[PDB]
Design a protein around this ligand. Sequence first.
Ligand SMILES: NC(=O)c1cccc(N)c1
Length: 190
Amino acid sequence: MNLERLAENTGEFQEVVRAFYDTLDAARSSIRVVRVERVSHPLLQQQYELYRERLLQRCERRPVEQVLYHGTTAPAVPDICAHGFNRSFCGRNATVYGKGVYFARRASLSVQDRYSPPNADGHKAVFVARVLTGDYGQGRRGLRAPPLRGPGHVLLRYDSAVDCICQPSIFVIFHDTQALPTHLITCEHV
Ligand SMILES: NC(=O)c1cccc(N)c1
């Protein structure tokens, strides 16, 4: 089982839900958390953990890791739990900042129907993922990998692509072990 239902009497549940509603902005009043589930994929967790340690040694930017959101469709949920996030299933809607997996800093964005469309029961899927944003650069329509660092840098590419280099709200990640789905929020409209 890649999904374990979290009980409301736990601190883990209350931290996920508090962080969700804090970033829900104008939607805070219009969205109800139905269910919270822990995502279990030990191989990815362990691989993510190694990636994390190498970025802590290397990166000029702190923090190396952010807790971001990813709204998805109901049929894509078993895929992410079992295999993690896959940039090859770019079907979703668009890839205006590159052909990667899109993460939002605020649940207010991921909770929009175009990202988390409700099923027939009105349940909307929003993954909580630990993402290794690292050193980021500007996203663009052509990107198949992170943006180029350009002159003044030893490395050729950044770790992630962003919507705005000044005040980022969207992060695009282009590596299979760079984002770890830790929870699934099943929410709905009031
Ligand atoms: N699918 C998503 O949650 C998401 C997050 C940030 C930006 C975009 N376009 C989508």
